[PDB]
Amino acid sequence: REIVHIQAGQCGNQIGAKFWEVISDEHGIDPTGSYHGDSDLQLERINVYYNEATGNKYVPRAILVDLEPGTMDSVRSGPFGQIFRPDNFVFGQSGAGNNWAKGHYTEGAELVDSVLDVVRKESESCDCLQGFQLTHSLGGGTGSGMGTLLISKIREEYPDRIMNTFSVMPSPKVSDTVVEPYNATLSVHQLVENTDETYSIDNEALYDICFRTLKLTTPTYGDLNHLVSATMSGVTTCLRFPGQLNADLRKLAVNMVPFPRLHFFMPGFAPLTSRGSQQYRALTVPELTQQMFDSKNMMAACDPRHGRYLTVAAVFRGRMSMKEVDEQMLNVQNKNSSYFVEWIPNNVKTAVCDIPPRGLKMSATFIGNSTAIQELFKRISEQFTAMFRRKAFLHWYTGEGMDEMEFTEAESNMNDLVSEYQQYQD
Amino acid sequence: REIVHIQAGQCGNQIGAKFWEVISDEHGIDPTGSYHGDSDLQLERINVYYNEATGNKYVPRAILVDLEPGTMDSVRSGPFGQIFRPDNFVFGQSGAGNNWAKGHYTEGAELVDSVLDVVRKESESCDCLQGFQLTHSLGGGTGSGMGTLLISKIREEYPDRIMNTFSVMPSPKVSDTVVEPYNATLSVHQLVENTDETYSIDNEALYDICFRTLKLTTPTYGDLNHLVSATMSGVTTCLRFPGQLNADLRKLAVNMVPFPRLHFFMPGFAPLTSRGSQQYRALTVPELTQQMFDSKNMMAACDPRHGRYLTVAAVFRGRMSMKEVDEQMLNVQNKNSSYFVEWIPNNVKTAVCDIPPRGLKMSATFIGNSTAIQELFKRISEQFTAMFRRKAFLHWYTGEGMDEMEFTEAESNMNDLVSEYQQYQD
Amino acid sequence: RECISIHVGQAGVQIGNACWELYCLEHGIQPDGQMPSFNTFFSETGAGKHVPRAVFVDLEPTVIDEVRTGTYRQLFHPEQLISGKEDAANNYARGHYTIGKEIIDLVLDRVRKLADQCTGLQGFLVFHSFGGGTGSGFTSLLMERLSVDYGKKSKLEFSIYPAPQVSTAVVEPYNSILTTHTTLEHSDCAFMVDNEAIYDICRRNLDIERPTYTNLNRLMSQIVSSITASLRFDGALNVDLTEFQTNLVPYPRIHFPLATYAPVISAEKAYHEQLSVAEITNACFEPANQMVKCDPRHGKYMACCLLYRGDVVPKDVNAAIATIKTKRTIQFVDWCPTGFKVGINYQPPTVVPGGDLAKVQRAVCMLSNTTAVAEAWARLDHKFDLMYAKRAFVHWYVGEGMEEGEFSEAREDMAALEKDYEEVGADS
Amino acid sequence: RECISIHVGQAGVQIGNACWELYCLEHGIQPDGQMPSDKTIGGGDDSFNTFFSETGAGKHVPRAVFVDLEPTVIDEVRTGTYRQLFHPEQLISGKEDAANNYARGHYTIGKEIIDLVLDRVRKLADQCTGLQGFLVFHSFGGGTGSGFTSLLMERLSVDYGKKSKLEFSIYPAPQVSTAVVEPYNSILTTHTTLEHSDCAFMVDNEAIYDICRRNLDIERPTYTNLNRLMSQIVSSITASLRFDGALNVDLTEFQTNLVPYPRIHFPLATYAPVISAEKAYHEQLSVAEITNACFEPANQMVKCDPRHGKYMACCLLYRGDVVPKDVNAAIATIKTKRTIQFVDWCPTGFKVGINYQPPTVVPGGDLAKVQRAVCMLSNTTAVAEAWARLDHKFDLMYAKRAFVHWYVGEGMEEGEFSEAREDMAALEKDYEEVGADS
Amino acid sequence: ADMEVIELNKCTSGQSFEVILKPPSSLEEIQKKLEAAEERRKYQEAELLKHLAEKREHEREVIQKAIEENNNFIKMAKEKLAQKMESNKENREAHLAAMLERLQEKDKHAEEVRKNKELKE
Ligand SMILES: Nc1nc2c(ncn2[C@@H]2O[C@H](COP(=O)(O)OP(=O)(O)OP(=O)(O)O)[C@@H](O)[C@H]2O)c(=O)[nH]1
Ligand SMILES: Nc1nc2c(ncn2[C@@H]2O[C@H](COP(=O)(O)OP(=O)(O)OP(=O)(O)O)[C@@H](O)[C@H]2O)c(=O)[nH]1
Ligand SMILES: COc1cc2c(c(OC)c1OC)-c1ccc(OC)c(=O)cc1[C@@H](NC(=O)CS)CC2
Ligand SMILES: COc1cc2c(c(OC)c1OC)-c1ccc(OC)c(=O)cc1[C@@H](NC(=O)CS)CC2
């Protein structure tokens, strides 16, 4: 199998720029240039993230969508800007909106096709499909809105093939914007219906990580962003790499998710941050693990604690011994045996991969299907419900062509999930 | 009269390979070659075991059956392998089975004819018939099963002509095989219905002879086997030889068997085993007889003791005087007069023949229709009944095409014989 | 006038062959034939051969083949030798019903074919084994039928009553009892010859550790010579067969005379002899020198009758019988005078040259009929009984076609004979 | 007469490939093909042909199918030497993966390749006059190992009525990488499998893994590490029907011998002297002891113990320099200082089979050269332990429908799940039932 | 004794005479009994040819009712296969082309209520 990428929105489109350029660094690609890295592995399963074209050169299987030029020429005029095949660039002209409606109805279904139809090519092009992965902000528009739409249109053009989203659930500290909950709760609805897995990367953590544990005074959009980029890195490693067994993304779904409702894994990462502060290396394995099962070492604001894990998976990074890893993990379901679902047996599985990421001799990444994650929901739902209260900033969606009650039948869908998530401490 | 031979089964077919090549040695035949032996007798009644063909040469009246090649090229590539007429070789290709069902129904009535129809030639060929004699294992298949079948098809093509079997009733020490009783009890049924004589050679003695009394550490299949070979040699002598009176096998049935139910003579033999100190040749006649009427010296496990004799017959071997033999036997029905049926007058008859066997200047052989023999039966019957108990390994015959109850109406036939055999201590 | 010898059964035949030889050795017939009142047994052939009036009949080859082998091979028409493929396998069942029926019409032919040339045949001398296959089975069936195709002409059976040791076989009692029931109305007179007693004699005087088959025969043939003979060389006491039952049997029932040949003694001792004309007589009156294993000193006598041979003029016999009386257990039953019909024959009692018995200057014979032959009738009947008391071997017959009620009712006839015997016996 | 090896599933295949190699190293086939030993192939009349059919004039080719619903695994074989050993046809690979569920293999993505497999299968036993059956290797749990296997089996029992079937199943232990959903998969297949199978060699990974830590002394037990171990068990289990001798022959009647009651009875094995080069020079090991240490809970095959469960058919398989006089008065002694355990009515077994043939191990292996080796195929009511150790895992996942829908989606019914576990219910009760009596 | 013995016959080679010592003081028209022999034989054996003509065609039956007991195994659960593996196409094209028939009503509701901008200022 092999996977293609949809990258959509101001956020979705840095989130992935930064993504690409740390995965491209792992297998080792110049701007387009071939491969340069004296360690041979890399190209094994570079099939997954790279369709290879003219000359020894490389090109990612990625497609880029925005409903205003700007944030595209951010990528071209930028890091690994010369890498993407120009007709994998779908810029919207128009006005982004930054209100879901615009991106899921009006300025959205304006572009939709051009996207949908290059995905068609790249996909129906690659030898045999796996699914799709998309990245975006779950708040604001184009990407929260245009995106949710794409998947709701990919599904149907591609139903047997399954689904992945890195969705940045937004917060109040770090980007204000009157509206977010509205967009979020609209998309939360969207997601739950038709993906099989979605990573819940929250900014309230992402920011709060960068503060109380990582000096960073006034945490940037970049220096921050970074976290996620490295997080996606691990979360893909085992589809991206070895022969230490494969990763049908499916295998990963129908193992992670017990219950159809795409239960969004909260992720976490091992080592973090530093330009001006990283010199540790002495990041041990004990010291690594009980740091990966930490509260504010997770990408979702949400301490396991207030919810058991349904199923968890960890992926480890570097020349280090499982002699020690096997035994260290098997201690975490002991010193913490209580907060793990009783009823799903070997619901902790781990894997070890011997090639470090950018810097960092040792690293681990965490995948967390836990009930507790409704904490993120019970939050946005009440940020919302407290606005949908006095039927608030809604005249903005009123008029763009929606019905009064779609807000309810999506509040009362989230507010649902809430309490089957709550329902599952039995 | 003249008798033809059916040899059937891995057992039946060594048993007889070993037989042939000790009788062929007595009348003296090369591989095919004529006769070379400066004592003239031999050819008298070589009619009986030899149909003579092209040139001065000889060929046995034998027919060989097996449901798998193997154990035939054992005979051809072996001892007197070049002796048998190739179309007296009926090999079954197929799979032996080693489960009666296979040999008496499926893989059996597959061959049957080819056999049946060569016997037809060889028989309806020889000048006037006597009966047939067949050799086989009474447990395992093809032979226990194919064989019992043959006789159940000989009878009918040959009803007036009567019946002889060397049937090795099997044991648990020496060949394991969780099934044997099943096959045995199946065949015990078979035999009892339609032969007029059968020799009950039991391995449990044959092995226990070779141990207890005959050094042999871990007794071979060969070195063992041998016993039976020499036992058949005697048991035939008086049909095979002199003019000291004839032997219509009939004239041997209607004298040995009072009661239609083919009462299986347990046999015994005089000297045994090895080149050493029975090969010292002071085997005297007293010392010979009271060793032939021994417990430890019979071919069936079964001490007369626990059963009187119905009728018994002994055949003696070598230049020795009946001055002594007549008088030595007529002592055994004295310092043993008690354990001999009251009611059948001269129920001990003996014959003397002056040509020794392989080696051995003096030898005797024993034919024993004794009630005691039910000890062999009361044995296999309960080895059986304790399996047919929890309807055991029987799904093996279940499915090959038998009825649940055929196992009973043959248990309840043996378990019958048991107690007319018991019934005959009145 | 003339006499046929039917031999049936292995024994019958071997006694025949080895007695018919003592016939030749007496009238001087070279095997070939020519011997350069004696035709009583033989009919003269073409111009040279002398040929017996004989039939030999068995249901195997073997026995008869060795007659067609050993010199004498020259003595018979191959026709008088009837052999019959499948054996009687040791039971009256077989002989009389199954494999007998098959050959009986062929025999019965050449039988006729023989008494046909013969103007005034006076009867048959049938030799057979008491027990055992065709000797009992066929014999009976033979007998049944002769008593039909030849009403008058009497019949003399010479039966070899089987003793335990000299190879019997289990089933025998059945066979003897069987035949001898179904035989006895068709027979006129019957010379039972118990083997034991012949065998015994052989160990006794002949001094053979081993008593050989043909050893026994040379003995018996002599008895058989002396019993016949009176009708062979001619000269009374019984010149004809109907003179046998005149003198020996008083009551229909076939009465079985016992014989007692005189001086058996072994060359080695051929030069001790000329034996007391008295003694030969007087040792012939001896339990120990008998024919059937009984004793006539615990059973009454009902017809004595000596047969003498050789140089003996009556004036001896006579006051030598008086003395065979006074120092003896006489025993004459109530009403049978005090017999002794005697017959000397002058004829040197010639014995066989490769024999064991020696040349003799006179010999006795004694054909006495006594209620003690009845001992041998239950010595057998016991063997029978307790075998039959468990059906022992029964079915080997019932299969070949017999009835149960044959067996039952045949033994229910010896029951009478045994009672018949002892009954007529000793009186008040 | 002749024997086909069907390999299905990642495990199935990797056991195959690294077992079929121990096949070659014993009969002497250097990848290439030709075994410049005697003849065959100019007239295949040798006793070694049990598994192979001789090609053209040189190469020796197995009677094999390797079938997986991914590439990867089989591409392995088409890559590493041995690449030269097979017809490329015997290696069936099938694009989209079985994604870890019986649903997949047996219904959706299985249906697609089954008809193509089933072809080259025939195409193999078609040249072969008197095929006598199949050896199916597969993973107990997990995708195509459970799913397709079942479908395969269902169908074979159709196109070949008679010809019996032996499954070698790798029953999955917790640590040696399972996956959550496994229980479901193994309970699924093993219900729908069991009436089409005749006899079944379950091989629990734990116990193999265990042995590798234990005597082989590997901190890490490698994937191909476990296989070399098992391939040896597999060699010894076969073999009796492979090369020959008066010594001993087939499992055609070692079944006859092993399983008494229709239900597929799952024999447990116990390979003899595993010891690591580093110690290849301590050996010549007690003809008594190899036996006596093979009669050991700690040296097993399945994670149970036959000392808290009755025995219903023992059967030693010996190899190398061993004449009976040993085994014999060395069984009597494996009978007096031991928990015997023979159930009411199965005599007191041990049909045994020596094979003379040097028990050749792998040269780049860890096991060392051996003078003689045991095997023990005993069927016991204690194999029933592993039947609920799994069934428990099942139950309480199913007691909340856990992962159900991932199948129901791919097309299954609920009442399959329900009624399949309602059959192990019977087997578990069947088992312990026939067991120990009065 | 005082015996007398009146003398009876004289031949060229013989003589006889009593010596008395003390006073005295079929038909077969019936060999029907012989055909009968065989009337019983060829019965009692032409009835072990027909108690065994039986032992026979059950053999050529038993192995025929396993060919009957196994034909009829391809019969059942060797096709239960095909119409259970159909009760798959049935069960899926329902759950699939019905996951298509709802992910297709965010088409009508998203198009005929987006042509709501028919409102506009
Ligand atoms: N006196 C004497 N008796 C014999 C002789 N041969 C056999 N017998 C006896 O007769 C009985 C056996 O009779 P056979 O004449 O052998 O029986 P058969 O069936 O008529 O003859 P076969 O056709 O050979 O079976 C036994 O009791 C023997 O003791 C012999 O040569 N002389
Ligand atoms: N003994 C052994 N077990 C293995 C091996 N590889 C995987 N397994 C086990 O087999 C089970 C997995 O079955 P798989 O065949 O890999 O899954 P599958 O879908 O059938 O085949 P895939 O498409 O490759 O997944 C698990 O219990 C693993 O522990 C191996 O090489 N040896
Ligand atoms: C990157 O590719 C991955 C792919 C998979 C898994 C996974 O999590 C570690 C991955 O890493 C993110 C995976 C998942 C989950 C399980 O339950 C927690 C499981 O048992 C098993 C797995 C994976 N492992 C195995 O099948 C051997 S454990 C199968 C699919
Ligand atoms: C195969 O050749 C033999 C055939 C027979 C006999 C026999 O002795 C056992 C044989 O030797 C092996 C035989 C047997 C048994 C008797 O009953 C014990 C009998 O009276 C009589 C005999 C045999 N002999 C005689 O009847 C003369 S005693 C005839 C049948």
Ligand SMILES: Nc1nc2c(ncn2[C@@H]2O[C@H](COP(=O)(O)OP(=O)(O)O)[C@@H](O)[C@H]2O)c(=O)[nH]1
């Ligand atoms: N953490 C993460 N969030 C971002 C980033 N850029 C924008 N966002 C968040 O995404 C939300 C707005 O989405 P955006 O992509 O700007 O709007 P769109 O182009 O209309 O999709 C806000 O909650 C922002 O905090 C980014 O670089 N990283």
Ligand SMILES: Nc1nc2c(ncn2[C@@H]2O[C@H](COP(=O)(O)OP(=O)(O)O)[C@@H](O)[C@H]2O)c(=O)[nH]1
């Ligand atoms: N002693 C004797 N018995 C044997 C021999 N071979 C096998 N048996 C016995 O017969 C039984 C096995 O039957 P067998 O003849 O080998 O199977 P078949 O080929 O189907 O007839 C076991 O009880 C063995 O003890 C042998 O040749 N001699």
